[PDB]
Design a binder for this molecule. Structure first.
Ligand code: UD1
Length: 349
């Protein structure tokens, strides 16, 4: 069997039909893929809707006896049941192009990808990464492409890549669980490819809670970030490349995650919890890596590593206001001292 399409469900009755219709409309043999649905203890009619496709799809259904607290555990249960040569993770409120499995099977057959990124499209307002999907590419790397800016699991992965290297989702975690999973898959794959010939993965914005907006404590969130830093630094790769991958991950994280601006947005009285958790993550990053990140991040790494919220916050407010304690302009960039007696940080733009 070529593919296992893995679908975690949770009270998905209002939309799960759109996904299952897109799976049944695949212009790809139904004998060559299976749909592995693991229901995270829904209380609605999700499962009765899924069972209407039993004779239409190669279908595997099971249900956890209690809600696991996120997508991770149902996808892990499904991954173990999966028999396809490759897996594709699709969320219950999304759907896929009818040529997706055909196009991906044809592309994998020629290029032997271990991880295949497939171009996504936002539906009614949903934002989706696009910077890595401007071109189809048989071979890309963590350092010569923007794949690190997309860590969602809505990609195709060789099943043996995941299982031979023991790559699973963290469980009982509302969100960011995918970042470690996909970074592990990136770090272990012999070849990563990008298929951009059409819109393959449609990501919707329905309502009710979306996981990636549910509460996760700073402690749980930044533990996944620390594990990622540990994972990179332990990969079987040359030392300089590992540092460079960690730096790129840090550029992404400080630009796009909840870390960005947290000292401006989080209630003052909650910020010591944030800097203690963020600092535990930055303390796993060797200081030599700071020289490789975007220069504007170097003071944030500095004060995070010292768990110094007052100076971290001064940096963020200085950026936001454009008011600095002292600074020089050298080569069109800023050399900034953010507070009396503190270091100057150079090259900021
Ligand atoms: C970036 C992207 O394109 N999609 C990700 C985004 O989607 P998103 O924020 O939309 O998260 P969702 O609410 O759709 O949950 C994702 C999937 O997990 C299932 N679910 C949800 C709650 C639960 O307790 N048990 C359960 O199985 C949903 O039915 C759904 O199939 O944030 C999630 C949390 O990191 C990721 O896993 C999604 O893949």
């Amino acid at each position: 069997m070529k593919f296992s399409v893995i679908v975690p469900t949770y009270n998905s009755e209002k939309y799960i039909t759109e996904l299952l219709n897109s799976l049944a409309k695949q212009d790809f043999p139904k004998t060559e893929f299976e749909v592995v649905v693991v229901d995270d203890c829904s209380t609605d009619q999700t499962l009765q809707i899924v069972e209407k496709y039993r004779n239409k799809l190669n279908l595997k259904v099971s249900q956890l006896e209690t809600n696991s607290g996120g997508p991770g555990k149902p996808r892990n249960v499904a991954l173990k049941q999966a028999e396809g040569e490759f897996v594709l993770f699709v969320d219950s409120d999304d759907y896929i192009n009818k040529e997706t499995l055909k196009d991906a099977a044809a592309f994998i057959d020629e290029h032997h990808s271990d991880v295949l990124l497939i171009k996504m499209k936002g539906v009614n307002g949903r934002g989706v990464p696009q910077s890595m999907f401007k071109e189809t590419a048989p071979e890309v790397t963590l350092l010569n492409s923007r794949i690190i800016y997309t860590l969602s699991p809505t990609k195709i992965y060789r099943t043996a890549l995941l299982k031979d290297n023991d790559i699973y989702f963290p469980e009982e975690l509302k969100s960011a669980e995918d970042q470690l999973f996909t970074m592990k898959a990136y770090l272990n794959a012999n070849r990563i490819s990008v298929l951009s010939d059409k819109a393959y993965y449609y990501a919707t914005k329905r309502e009710g809670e979306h996981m990636s907006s549910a509460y996760v404590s700073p402690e749980d969130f930044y533990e996944v970030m620390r594990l990622i830093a540990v994972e990179i630094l332990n990969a079987d790769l040359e030392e300089a490349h590992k540092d460079q991958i960690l730096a790129e991950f840090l550029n992404r994280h400080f630009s796009f995650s909840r870390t960005n601006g947290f000292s401006l947005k989080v209630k003052l009285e909650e910020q010591p919890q944030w800097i203690n958790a963020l600092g535990d993550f930055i303390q796993a990053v060797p200081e030599r890596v700071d020289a490789l990140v975007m220069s504007k991040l170097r003071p944030l790494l500095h004060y995070a590593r010292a768990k110094d919220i007052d100076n971290y916050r001064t940096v963020e407010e200085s950026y936001r206001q454009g008011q600095y304690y002292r600074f020089d302009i050298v080569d069109g960039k800023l050399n900034i001292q953010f507070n009396e007696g503190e270091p100057y940080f150079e090259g900021i733009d």
